[PDB]
Amino acid sequence: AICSALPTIPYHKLADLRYLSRGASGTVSSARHADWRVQVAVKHLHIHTPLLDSERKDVLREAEILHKARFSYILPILGICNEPEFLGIVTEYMPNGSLNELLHRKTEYPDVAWPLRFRILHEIALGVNYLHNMTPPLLHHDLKTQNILLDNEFHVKIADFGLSKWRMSAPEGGTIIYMPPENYEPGRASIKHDIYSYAVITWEVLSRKQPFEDVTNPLQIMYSVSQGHRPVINEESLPYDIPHRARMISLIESGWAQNPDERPSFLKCLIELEPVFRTFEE
Amino acid sequence: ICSALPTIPYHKLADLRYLSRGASGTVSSARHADWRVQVAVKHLHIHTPLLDSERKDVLREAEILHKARFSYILPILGICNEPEFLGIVTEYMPNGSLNELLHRKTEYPDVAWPLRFRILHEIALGVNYLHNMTPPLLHHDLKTQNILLDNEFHVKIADFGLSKWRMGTIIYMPPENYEPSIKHDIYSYAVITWEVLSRKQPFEDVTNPLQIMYSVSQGHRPVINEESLPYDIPHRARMISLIESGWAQNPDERPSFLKCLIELEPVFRTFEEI
Ligand SMILES: Nc1ncnc2c1ncn2[C@@H]1O[C@H](COP(=O)(O)OP(=O)(O)CP(=O)(O)O)[C@@H](O)[C@H]1O
Ligand SMILES: Nc1ncnc2c1ncn2[C@@H]1O[C@H](COP(=O)(O)OP(=O)(O)CP(=O)(O)O)[C@@H](O)[C@H]1O
Ligand SMILES: [Co+2]
Ligand SMILES: [Mg+2]
Ligand SMILES: [Mg+2]
């Protein structure tokens, strides 16, 4: 049993802690590791409140998942900082933010060239396919453009394993826009959540649009999706000059199909799309 | 918190092609049939039956790579462990080795300074990480052929075949290793630094390795002059000073990698992003 231990990073080795992002459940900060001399990201529980023991278990579980799931397109975990009053997952620092920022910050990024977009889509599928091929399979359950991070040369690192589950009545978690309709309510199709999210991501990458942008109430989105409505496919959302437009639309519509049986495995998706990805030059 | 190294069944390796044969094994490219990625496979000779001592060497190397994972270390993806096949499966590095970058002058007429300095910085970060493990991992075979370059020319340190937990060419070896070794890696790094900044083969004109060994034991080192190291090398004086400490006759005069990074960080910092 060849084993790799996740390093424990003592608190005094984290220098220059700076707020990057605060959320509901925790905070992401940048830091430098004083000994390794690299920039890191630290995803930690709130510094304000005392540390709840159930919150501690959630962080340890996420850290273990990241550690086990390591692969070319998955955010590398560097260690865990586990202290009486501080608990943080230490990962590689991603200099180029998230796919969300790339797609929707149109002043910062006026042009996002097709080969880059297709490489991003290919790398996401490779990352998730890897997760689904683990024993037991790891299901991400929160794939979205905000959780696809971009390294120094805009290669994909899938992040945020907070809702992930090993496949071994309540529905799984997720973000509503990227969630298939069968996951909305209590009461086998669990494995087809990630591909649905990927289809919405693909639509979002090729359009540079917010899915369901005109729909102001998320409950209306949920009602419409449960009736089979999806982000709009027309000349306006998806211009005619998108490379391999017909094949990509066909794949999207299978990926987000109402019937989960009509959605491909990620392996199937890769087999179907490899000829498309291959047409692009380095 | 434990991570298991995957066992990759032989039937999942497709399109096996010879890349490089050495004395102890062979490196082949392949595709993983399920993961749909290109891989490199470092395996024992397909011709001979598999000696059990050779098997243990490969397993030991695989374990070291698995434990040593870090941003500047070659990622191991799994082990293929079969009755008649034994191979370490790693990420495929598209841009070869630092050796090829430096010495294939038709293929690479210009290697710009910011790239060279970034490479030197990343090597030191990789080795510093190894030396900071508990117990420390000593590489003991650092050379330009063992520094691999990924798709955007970032460093992955490879070849852990001679590595040791702290409980072939002699040009990168300090003299105390062959006098008739905690400071071995930094000595190799000093020679690598000279090689990166010069684009020259260390001791190129010395035809007998025994002459190299004798000369080094007497304090001779790769030549530092205007010809080997041009005056227009950024931070030339500081870099020469560092090199000469890194390969100092007395191992006590050679820095830790942490010390080397502390001393060189201001130099590395002057360069803009590529
Ligand atoms: N390694 C990393 N490098 C650089 N930035 C990172 C990073 N990890 C996270 N971030 C930034 O922090 C933000 C939140 O990270 P993440 O999604 O994992 O936290 P979280 O799970 O607590 C949000 P939520 O509670 O909504 O699920 C990311 O969108 C990104 O901007
Ligand atoms: N992941 C990888 N990706 C691409 N090429 C690789 C590679 N790993 C090794 N190579 C190539 O094979 C060559 C030899 O690899 P490596 O040094 O690890 O084997 P080895 O230890 O058997 C040689 P020696 O017997 O001299 O020690 C490398 O220099 C490189 O050209
Ligand atoms: Co498990
Ligand atoms: Mg989350
Ligand atoms: Mg070797």
XYZ file of C-alpha atoms and ligand atoms in Angstrom:
621
model
C 0.000 0.000 0.000
C 2.124 2.918 -1.356
C 0.867 5.903 0.687
C 1.440 9.705 0.505
C 0.611 11.700 3.662
C -0.936 15.177 3.340
C 1.522 17.649 4.959
C 0.433 19.490 8.113
C 1.589 23.086 7.799
C 2.255 24.790 11.179
C 0.496 28.184 11.461
C 3.777 30.129 11.983
C 4.904 29.069 8.457
C 2.089 31.048 6.771
C 3.283 34.600 6.111
C 1.509 37.660 4.680
C -2.096 36.368 5.032
C -4.398 38.567 2.915
C -8.148 38.348 2.255
C -8.977 37.273 -1.320
C -12.643 36.205 -1.001
C -15.113 35.752 1.871
C -18.080 33.414 1.516
C -20.826 32.055 3.771
C -18.949 28.974 5.058
C -15.355 30.282 4.896
C -12.707 32.650 3.556
C -10.004 32.274 0.897
C -6.758 34.152 1.660
C -3.447 34.419 -0.168
C -0.248 33.730 1.790
C 3.400 32.766 1.379
C 4.866 29.621 2.828
C 7.869 30.910 4.791
C 10.002 27.775 4.187
C 8.944 26.701 0.672
C 9.143 30.306 -0.618
C 6.008 30.021 -2.779
C 2.701 31.851 -2.899
C -0.254 29.755 -1.678
C -4.031 30.048 -1.325
C -5.570 29.239 2.065
C -9.259 28.235 2.307
C -10.064 28.617 5.997
C -12.986 28.885 8.451
C -13.981 32.375 9.717
C -11.324 33.952 12.004
C -14.116 35.779 13.937
C -16.193 32.837 15.319
C -14.885 29.974 17.536
C -14.431 26.680 15.637
C -17.428 24.312 15.514
C -16.431 20.614 15.473
C -18.840 19.789 12.610
C -17.231 22.581 10.545
C -13.811 21.049 11.290
C -14.914 17.642 9.916
C -16.199 19.259 6.693
C -12.806 20.891 6.058
C -10.880 17.673 6.806
C -13.177 15.745 4.469
C -12.666 18.269 1.646
C -8.863 18.207 2.217
C -8.824 14.404 2.020
C -10.830 14.407 -1.197
C -8.465 16.954 -2.822
C -5.463 14.923 -1.676
C -6.828 11.647 -3.117
C -8.102 13.248 -6.371
C -4.796 14.755 -7.449
C -4.369 14.885 -11.227
C -3.224 17.248 -14.000
C -6.543 19.189 -14.134
C -7.420 19.209 -10.413
C -6.298 21.994 -8.019
C -3.206 20.675 -6.152
C -3.495 20.618 -2.351
C -0.185 21.442 -0.611
C -1.217 20.802 2.978
C -3.592 21.427 5.863
C -3.119 24.050 8.596
C -4.888 22.504 11.586
C -4.710 24.617 14.783
C -6.921 25.159 17.910
C -8.298 28.417 16.447
C -7.388 28.150 12.711
C -8.268 25.517 10.122
C -7.297 25.955 6.481
C -6.730 23.996 3.297
C -3.496 25.179 1.662
C -3.467 24.900 -2.157
C -1.361 26.127 -5.101
C -2.089 29.780 -5.849
C -3.893 30.213 -9.202
C -2.754 33.571 -10.723
C -5.447 33.891 -13.411
C -8.619 33.645 -11.339
C -11.627 31.621 -12.485
C -13.214 30.760 -15.822
C -16.153 32.937 -14.700
C -13.907 36.039 -14.660
C -12.390 35.128 -18.051
C -15.811 34.801 -19.699
C -17.742 37.685 -18.139
C -15.140 40.453 -17.529
C -15.343 41.729 -21.093
C -13.285 44.935 -20.551
C -10.455 42.949 -18.912
C -10.705 40.246 -21.635
C -12.152 41.683 -24.903
C -11.087 38.619 -26.927
C -11.042 35.002 -25.730
C -9.834 33.049 -28.757
C -11.514 29.793 -29.841
C -8.492 27.489 -29.371
C -8.239 28.596 -25.711
C -11.981 28.058 -25.123
C -11.897 24.559 -26.622
C -8.726 23.645 -24.700
C -10.469 24.771 -21.474
C -13.527 22.616 -22.316
C -11.271 19.638 -23.139
C -9.320 19.999 -19.859
C -12.501 20.265 -17.758
C -13.783 17.011 -19.302
C -10.397 15.323 -18.667
C -10.419 16.465 -15.034
C -13.985 15.279 -14.360
C -13.457 12.021 -16.311
C -10.491 11.342 -14.008
C -12.706 11.877 -10.899
C -15.405 9.555 -12.285
C -12.771 6.838 -12.998
C -11.515 6.690 -9.386
C -12.460 3.656 -7.275
C -14.879 4.552 -5.866
C -15.853 7.345 -8.345
C -15.744 10.928 -7.054
C -18.729 13.064 -8.085
C -17.985 16.799 -7.952
C -21.589 18.120 -7.672
C -20.586 21.820 -7.894
C -19.118 22.291 -11.325
C -19.512 25.860 -12.485
C -17.371 28.520 -14.114
C -16.510 30.057 -10.705
C -15.029 26.678 -9.651
C -12.833 26.258 -12.726
C -9.557 28.013 -11.852
C -6.894 29.093 -14.321
C -3.158 28.704 -13.668
C -0.372 31.012 -14.966
C -0.821 29.867 -18.607
C -4.642 29.514 -18.468
C -4.739 25.742 -17.975
C -7.680 24.336 -15.967
C -7.590 23.378 -12.286
C -10.966 22.138 -11.014
C -11.540 23.466 -7.502
C -14.115 23.529 -4.653
C -14.788 19.953 -3.540
C -17.097 21.125 -0.703
C -20.149 19.317 -2.100
C -18.335 16.319 -3.599
C -19.292 12.722 -2.796
C -17.735 9.291 -3.202
C -20.193 7.125 -5.151
C -20.663 4.080 -2.843
C -33.785 10.616 -0.162
C -32.291 14.160 0.137
C -30.808 15.516 -3.124
C -27.095 16.312 -3.490
C -26.035 19.953 -3.187
C -24.986 22.280 -5.971
C -25.585 25.620 -7.646
C -29.087 25.898 -9.157
C -28.208 27.014 -12.721
C -25.751 24.074 -13.155
C -27.982 21.512 -11.409
C -30.090 18.964 -13.342
C -33.874 19.101 -12.561
C -33.957 15.608 -10.951
C -31.580 16.960 -8.242
C -34.053 19.654 -7.133
C -36.111 17.467 -4.755
C -35.897 14.493 -2.350
C -36.413 10.963 -3.754
C -29.670 6.175 -9.192
C -29.161 9.124 -11.624
C -26.701 10.787 -9.131
C -23.810 10.051 -11.561
C -25.334 12.292 -14.292
C -25.189 15.569 -12.320
C -21.643 16.591 -13.429
C -22.306 16.129 -17.163
C -25.397 18.370 -16.925
C -23.232 21.071 -15.278
C -20.635 20.551 -18.031
C -23.275 21.113 -20.758
C -24.253 24.461 -19.119
C -20.527 25.331 -18.777
C -20.032 24.522 -22.495
C -22.963 26.772 -23.456
C -21.510 29.523 -21.186
C -17.974 29.215 -22.645
C -19.177 29.332 -26.260
C -21.664 32.205 -25.660
C -19.865 34.308 -23.024
C -23.380 34.745 -21.575
C -24.870 34.250 -18.135
C -27.258 31.260 -18.281
C -30.887 32.428 -17.724
C -29.704 36.075 -17.536
C -33.199 37.563 -18.023
C -34.818 35.360 -15.348
C -34.745 37.307 -12.070
C -36.137 34.701 -9.628
C -34.146 31.399 -9.234
C -37.404 29.577 -8.454
C -38.685 30.552 -11.906
C -35.488 29.085 -13.404
C -36.140 25.867 -11.476
C -39.770 25.716 -12.654
C -38.753 26.331 -16.308
C -35.890 23.771 -16.200
C -38.173 21.134 -14.653
C -40.435 21.676 -17.714
C -37.480 21.146 -20.081
C -36.374 24.742 -20.782
C -32.621 25.367 -21.018
C -30.310 28.303 -21.756
C -31.302 29.704 -25.159
C -29.717 28.373 -28.340
C -30.073 30.742 -31.311
C -27.881 32.921 -33.567
C -27.744 35.596 -30.850
C -26.534 33.363 -27.959
C -24.360 31.121 -30.158
C -23.032 32.967 -33.294
C -22.795 31.068 -36.604
C -18.997 31.448 -36.689
C -18.403 29.165 -33.633
C -16.075 26.367 -34.851
C -17.910 23.002 -35.054
C -21.138 24.765 -34.009
C -23.504 21.923 -35.045
C -21.536 19.212 -33.199
C -21.123 21.358 -30.084
C -24.858 22.211 -29.936
C -25.696 18.510 -30.431
C -23.362 17.586 -27.530
C -24.761 20.367 -25.260
C -28.340 19.198 -25.836
C -27.438 15.598 -24.992
C -25.421 16.734 -21.950
C -28.353 18.634 -20.451
C -31.102 16.246 -21.673
C -34.176 15.974 -19.404
C -33.682 12.179 -19.331
C -30.366 11.427 -17.515
C -30.021 8.215 -19.645
C -29.551 10.435 -22.698
C -26.571 12.236 -21.097
C -23.126 10.697 -21.799
C -20.479 9.513 -19.312
C -17.443 11.836 -19.405
C -15.554 9.029 -21.193
C -18.252 8.907 -23.850
C -18.197 12.719 -24.068
C -14.387 12.663 -24.597
C -14.607 9.915 -27.266
C -17.303 11.919 -29.103
C -15.459 15.272 -28.839
C -11.791 14.228 -29.320
C -11.995 14.694 -33.153
C -13.294 18.276 -32.571
C -10.606 19.130 -29.948
C -7.895 17.667 -32.256
C -8.625 20.169 -35.086
C -7.112 23.041 -33.054
C -3.408 23.943 -33.292
C -1.197 24.464 -30.197
C -4.737 11.686 5.629
C -3.422 9.215 3.014
C -3.365 9.127 -0.841
C -2.785 5.741 -2.543
C -0.662 5.554 -5.711
C -2.922 4.124 -8.480
C -2.101 0.732 -10.006
C -2.582 1.014 -13.757
C -3.490 -2.325 -15.432
C -1.291 -3.081 -18.470
C -4.264 -3.239 -20.910
C -4.988 0.465 -20.189
C -1.675 1.578 -21.765
C -2.187 2.139 -25.495
C 0.221 3.132 -28.283
C 3.461 2.268 -26.384
C 6.398 3.825 -28.252
C 10.125 3.842 -27.465
C 11.364 7.326 -26.457
C 14.719 6.590 -24.774
C 16.660 3.501 -23.675
C 19.195 3.633 -20.862
C 21.331 1.100 -19.002
C 18.797 0.278 -16.249
C 15.523 0.829 -18.162
C 13.526 2.370 -21.009
C 11.242 5.403 -21.233
C 8.238 4.998 -23.566
C 5.340 7.291 -24.439
C 1.790 5.915 -24.221
C -1.845 6.959 -23.897
C -3.994 5.956 -20.982
C -7.039 4.380 -22.645
C -9.489 5.507 -19.911
C -8.056 8.886 -18.849
C -7.496 9.970 -22.478
C -4.138 11.646 -21.756
C -0.603 11.112 -23.027
C 1.746 9.580 -20.431
C 5.407 8.639 -20.078
C 6.247 5.120 -18.886
C 9.650 4.387 -17.289
C 9.933 0.604 -17.382
C 12.451 -2.259 -17.069
C 13.829 -3.871 -20.271
C 11.140 -5.847 -22.187
C 13.800 -8.349 -23.413
C 15.103 -9.806 -20.088
C 12.977 -11.585 -17.415
C 12.298 -9.426 -14.325
C 14.878 -9.630 -11.508
C 13.312 -9.205 -8.041
C 15.973 -6.699 -6.874
C 15.235 -4.592 -9.985
C 11.524 -4.709 -9.073
C 12.237 -3.305 -5.576
C 14.283 -0.426 -7.071
C 11.355 0.610 -9.289
C 8.843 0.377 -6.415
C 11.146 2.457 -4.209
C 11.498 5.150 -6.901
C 7.701 5.167 -7.461
C 7.102 5.631 -3.719
C 9.571 8.496 -3.534
C 7.953 10.299 -6.508
C 4.520 9.785 -4.959
C 5.590 11.216 -1.566
C 7.615 14.103 -3.087
C 4.806 15.587 -5.152
C 5.001 19.366 -5.498
C 4.676 22.110 -8.147
C 8.247 21.586 -9.510
C 8.501 17.790 -9.214
C 7.451 15.430 -12.052
C 3.949 14.124 -11.183
C 3.601 10.342 -10.911
C 0.213 9.098 -12.170
C 0.562 5.440 -11.221
C 2.512 2.193 -11.340
C 2.034 -0.601 -13.901
C 3.025 -3.725 -11.977
C 2.653 -6.981 -13.973
C 4.369 -10.445 -14.059
C 6.481 -9.411 -17.083
C 6.141 -5.576 -17.098
C 7.025 -2.988 -14.470
C 6.716 0.715 -15.215
C 6.376 4.066 -13.480
C 3.672 6.099 -15.241
C 4.201 9.885 -15.133
C 2.812 13.016 -16.818
C 4.209 13.416 -20.328
C 6.553 16.428 -20.603
C 6.201 17.863 -24.166
C 9.313 20.072 -24.156
C 12.019 17.551 -23.303
C 14.843 18.321 -20.872
C 16.810 21.415 -19.918
C 19.821 19.712 -21.544
C 18.099 19.800 -24.966
C 17.014 23.436 -24.487
C 20.551 24.586 -23.662
C 22.637 22.558 -26.119
C 20.436 22.141 -29.254
C 21.413 25.519 -30.660
C 19.828 25.076 -34.139
C 16.498 24.034 -32.572
C 16.753 26.869 -29.988
C 18.923 29.771 -31.298
C 17.755 32.137 -28.532
C 16.936 31.224 -24.917
C 15.935 34.526 -23.336
C 17.245 35.560 -19.901
C 13.869 35.710 -18.097
C 13.218 32.055 -19.052
C 16.683 30.953 -17.894
C 16.300 32.708 -14.525
C 12.766 31.358 -14.045
C 14.114 27.838 -14.722
C 16.908 28.359 -12.146
C 14.399 29.706 -9.595
C 12.025 26.740 -10.117
C 14.821 24.159 -9.791
C 15.833 25.695 -6.442
C 12.152 25.720 -5.303
C 11.775 22.056 -6.265
C 14.941 20.935 -4.479
C 14.258 23.162 -1.442
C 10.879 21.409 -1.135
C 12.591 17.964 -1.155
C 15.106 19.074 1.503
C 12.231 20.364 3.710
C 10.403 16.997 3.826
C 10.526 14.987 7.077
C 12.807 13.175 6.656
C 14.568 15.283 3.947
C 14.785 13.765 0.468
C 18.186 14.224 -1.222
C 17.968 13.952 -5.028
C 21.624 13.044 -5.731
C 21.292 13.031 -9.525
C 20.560 16.622 -10.429
C 21.689 17.446 -13.942
C 20.249 19.227 -16.966
C 19.070 15.901 -18.476
C 16.938 15.338 -15.327
C 15.252 18.748 -15.407
C 12.164 18.301 -17.618
C 10.141 21.072 -19.228
C 6.331 21.025 -19.445
C 4.165 22.592 -22.207
C 5.012 26.172 -21.140
C 8.660 25.465 -20.166
C 8.102 25.203 -16.415
C 10.448 22.871 -14.484
C 9.611 19.327 -13.395
C 12.512 17.655 -11.583
C 12.680 14.009 -12.630
C 14.737 10.802 -12.135
C 14.672 9.829 -8.455
C 16.693 6.640 -9.138
C 19.606 7.706 -6.916
C 17.594 9.621 -4.303
C 17.948 8.955 -0.569
C 15.988 9.797 2.575
C 18.332 11.565 5.012
C 17.933 9.354 8.134
C 27.173 7.879 -15.254
C 28.630 11.387 -15.347
C 30.646 12.799 -12.425
C 30.447 16.437 -13.587
C 27.590 17.324 -11.164
C 29.126 15.437 -8.221
C 31.077 17.233 -5.456
C 34.698 16.041 -4.940
C 34.090 14.587 -1.439
C 31.978 11.824 -3.089
C 35.028 10.327 -4.788
C 37.971 11.251 -2.481
C 40.254 8.132 -2.420
C 26.647 13.802 1.514
C 24.147 16.487 2.594
C 25.712 19.204 0.332
C 25.619 17.160 -2.897
C 22.478 18.733 -4.484
C 23.657 22.338 -4.070
C 26.975 21.497 -5.788
C 25.001 20.017 -8.726
C 22.837 23.169 -8.738
C 25.917 25.437 -8.992
C 27.136 23.446 -12.055
C 23.585 23.601 -13.508
C 23.557 27.390 -12.974
C 26.919 27.758 -14.764
C 25.558 25.540 -17.591
C 22.299 27.540 -17.930
C 24.075 30.908 -18.034
C 26.836 29.731 -20.434
C 24.975 27.252 -22.677
C 28.232 25.248 -22.454
C 29.018 21.657 -21.535
C 30.941 21.687 -18.210
C 34.544 20.414 -18.727
C 33.832 19.970 -22.468
C 37.524 19.843 -23.463
C 38.422 17.296 -20.744
C 38.269 13.918 -22.505
C 38.964 11.516 -19.605
C 36.482 11.520 -16.628
C 39.399 10.658 -14.305
C 41.034 13.954 -15.265
C 37.773 15.728 -14.361
C 37.704 13.934 -10.995
C 41.354 14.667 -10.242
C 41.020 18.309 -11.308
C 37.840 18.886 -9.259
C 39.420 17.269 -6.187
C 42.214 19.878 -6.547
C 39.679 22.724 -6.723
C 39.262 23.224 -10.512
C 35.737 24.043 -11.698
C 34.055 24.897 -15.010
C 35.771 27.998 -16.426
C 34.540 31.472 -15.504
C 35.683 34.187 -17.931
C 34.212 36.559 -20.544
C 34.080 33.689 -23.070
C 32.098 31.205 -20.894
C 29.991 33.860 -19.145
C 29.469 37.020 -21.321
C 29.477 40.454 -19.633
C 25.846 41.075 -20.619
C 24.435 38.303 -18.335
C 21.943 40.057 -16.000
C 23.272 40.232 -12.404
C 26.506 38.563 -13.581
C 28.567 39.438 -10.455
C 25.948 38.108 -8.002
C 25.365 34.957 -10.054
C 29.114 34.185 -10.274
C 29.426 34.801 -6.504
C 26.546 32.359 -5.852
C 27.968 29.712 -8.242
C 31.372 29.833 -6.526
C 29.806 29.372 -3.081
C 27.533 26.584 -4.384
C 30.455 24.560 -5.731
C 32.956 25.531 -2.971
C 35.586 22.923 -2.095
C 34.509 23.096 1.564
C 30.885 21.807 1.816
C 30.350 24.150 4.853
C 30.716 27.106 2.474
C 27.853 25.828 0.266
C 24.373 27.140 1.211
C 21.191 25.220 2.066
C 18.602 25.599 -0.722
C 16.625 27.859 1.640
C 19.670 30.082 2.073
C 20.238 30.009 -1.709
C 16.609 31.128 -2.286
C 16.840 33.916 0.342
C 20.066 35.185 -1.283
C 18.715 34.982 -4.870
C 15.065 36.084 -4.454
C 15.961 39.799 -5.065
C 17.673 38.769 -8.355
C 14.747 36.541 -9.497
C 12.258 39.335 -8.594
C 13.792 41.826 -11.094
C 12.402 39.849 -14.059
C 8.968 40.557 -15.579
C 6.477 37.722 -16.272
C 6.844 35.698 -19.529
N -5.929 28.104 -5.245
C -6.702 29.313 -5.413
N -5.914 30.220 -6.014
C -6.377 31.460 -6.318
N -7.662 31.790 -5.996
C -8.457 30.881 -5.378
C -7.987 29.651 -5.071
N -8.942 28.939 -4.466
C -10.006 29.729 -4.396
N -9.717 30.926 -4.952
C -10.643 32.036 -5.037
O -11.714 31.936 -3.828
C -12.912 31.820 -4.372
C -13.746 30.807 -3.559
O -13.116 29.553 -3.591
P -14.104 28.273 -3.339
O -15.218 28.239 -4.385
O -13.311 26.979 -3.277
O -14.681 28.628 -1.835
P -16.134 28.175 -1.239
O -16.341 26.703 -1.495
O -16.146 28.376 0.266
C -17.367 29.258 -2.110
P -19.080 28.637 -1.779
O -19.369 28.691 -0.296
O -20.038 29.490 -2.570
O -19.208 27.219 -2.224
C -12.652 31.299 -5.807
O -13.673 31.587 -6.655
C -11.339 32.036 -6.162
O -11.657 33.443 -6.558
N 7.631 12.284 -17.997
C 8.578 12.293 -19.092
N 8.009 12.938 -20.118
C 8.669 13.103 -21.298
N 9.930 12.599 -21.422
C 10.509 11.933 -20.386
C 9.838 11.769 -19.231
N 10.593 11.094 -18.364
C 11.738 10.831 -18.968
N 11.705 11.344 -20.216
C 12.805 11.255 -21.161
O 13.739 9.956 -20.911
C 14.949 10.361 -20.571
C 15.516 9.446 -19.452
O 14.637 9.515 -18.359
P 15.217 9.200 -16.852
O 16.433 10.060 -16.557
O 14.156 9.443 -15.799
O 15.562 7.594 -16.960
P 16.858 6.809 -16.333
O 16.986 7.081 -14.854
O 16.670 5.319 -16.520
C 18.346 7.327 -17.323
P 19.900 6.854 -16.420
O 20.115 5.363 -16.501
O 21.033 7.592 -17.099
O 19.741 7.265 -14.964
C 14.712 11.800 -20.050
O 15.831 12.587 -20.036
C 13.615 12.283 -21.026
O 14.218 12.591 -22.354
Co -12.313 6.797 -0.197
Mg -17.926 25.482 -2.335
Mg 18.387 7.767 -13.334
